[PDB]
Symmetry: none
Subunit: 75 residues, 12 copies
């Protein structure tokens, strides 16, 4: 028989932020030492890997708002 | 027989933040030391891995609001 | 029989941010030492890998808002 | 009248060490964080000072034997 | 009247060391962070000072034996 | 009256070392971060000062034996 | 609803002085001595300050009458 | 509704002085001595300051007869 | 909505002074000594300062009558 | 009859002082006030006079030894 | 009859001082005030006079030793 | 009869001073005020006079030693 599919997501949305001031932010890691030694590693699909990282991150987005959507239809 | 599917999510929404001031934030890890040694690792699908990480993070978004949605239809 | 598919996402959305001032941000790593030694690595598909990283990152986007969408229809 | 002083230490002495191997010694300081805050330093005689030092020492003498002697005569 | 002094120390002494091997010695400082804050420094006699040092030392003498002697006569 | 001084130290003394091999010695400082802040310095007599040093030393003498003597006679 | 404010202060007043003579006034300060010692001054807001002053004042107004008035209305 | 503000201060006032003579006024400071010692001064906002003054002053107004009035209305 | 504001200060005021004579005023400072000593003078906003002044002043205004008024309306 | 007078005083004397060091002296008079009121000052023979003085004296002689003698003969 | 006078005073005398150092001496008068009032002065023989002085003296003689003598014979 | 007078004073005397160093002497009068008021000043013989002085004196003689003598004979 006849198959009728209607997919219509409707969105009216606002992700909003107001900040009078961002500042006077201090992040103070002292340099550093790292060592990695390896024989066999076997990564086969979508593998995300961090080994021996010594990461310092400072992230001050004035907004930093995120909107994420996934729309999927399968037949 | 005939199949009729209607998918219509309707969204009217606001994610909001108001701040007079963000500031005077201090973060103080001592530098650092890391060692990793490996023989055999076997990651086969979507594996997310951190080994021996020494990560310092400072994250001060003025907003930082998140809106996340998933819409999925399957036949 | 006849198959009719209608896919029509409708979106009116705003990711917005107002900041009066971004400033006086200090991030203070002093260099460093890194060593990596390897024999066999076997990365086969979509593998993302970081080994022995010593990353200092400073990121101050005036906005930094993100809107991400994925739309998929499969038959 | 007569004063006679005779002084005579006689020393036969041996300070000895034997070691088969001085090795596989690891000194791996994990970093550190130090802060000092002051009004005045006002150092007027024979002051020895360290302020905010973060000093690492590794000392592996193959012998490291010490012999110390003092002879003093006063009249 | 007569004063006679005889001062005659006699020394036979040996400071000795035997080592089969000095090695495989690692000194690997993980960095570090130091801060010092002051108004005045006012150093007026024989002051020895270190301010804010971050000093690494590796000292592996094959012998490193020490002999110290002092002889003093005062009249 | 007569003053007679006779001063005769006699020394046969040996500071001696054997090492079969010096080697495979690693000195690997992971950097570092130092800050010093002041208004005035006022150093007036015999002052020894180090400010903000970041000093790495490696010292591997094949002998490194020391013998020190002082002889003083005062009238 | 309707709001009516009527503010009507009425002032009929006299500040009066009669003097047969203002005079034969002697101010003869006998000199003086003042000493002040300090490390730092750190003035951050609205200070009215006098430090170590030795100030002589003679003030002889013939009338010197003072009238001070304030009228304030807020809505 | 209708807002009506009427502000009508009425002032008839006299500050009056009668003096038969202003005079024969002597101000004769016997000198003086002042000393001030400091290291740093850090004035950041609206400071009115006098340091180490030896200020003499004579003020003989014939009237000297001040009237001060504000009138403020705010909406 | 409908507003009215009416402001009508009516002032008939007089500062009056009668003096038979202004005179025979002597200001005779016997000198003086001032010393002021400092390292740094950081003045950052609206600062009024006097340092080490030896200031003599004389005033003999014939009237010196003062009338000060301020009229302020804000909406 | 015949008169014989012999006047022969003999003086052998020493006025001595030994000082290692003279110093660190402050004389800081706090000002002062004097008034003296008189009619007639008839001074007729050998008068030494001070009237209404305000005198300050500082006297630090390295020796300051005084020897005074008087020898008088009358017939 | 015959008059014989012998007047023969004999002096061998020493006024002595030894000083290692004179110094660091301070005199700081705080001004002062003096008034003197008289009708008549009538000084008739050998008068020494001071009237109304305000005198400051600093006197630091490296010796300042004094030897004073009078030798008088009258007939 | 015959008059024989012999006046023969014999003097061998020394005023001595030894100083290793003269220095660092400070004299700083803060002014002062003097007034003197008189009608008639009749001074008739050997008068020494000071009226209304305001004198500052600094005297640092390297020796400043004084030897004073008076020798008088009358018949």
């Amino acid at each position: 028989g006849s198959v009728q599919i209607v997919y219509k997501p409707v969105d009216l949305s606002k992700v909003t932020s107001k900040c009078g001031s961002l500042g006077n932010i201090h992040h103070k890691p002292g340099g550093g030492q790292v060592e990695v030694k390896s024989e066999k590693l076997d990564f086969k699909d979508r593998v995300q890997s961090k080994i021996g990282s010594l990461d310092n991150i400072t992230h001050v987005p004035g907004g930093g708002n995120k909107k994420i959507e996934t729309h999927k239809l399968t037949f």
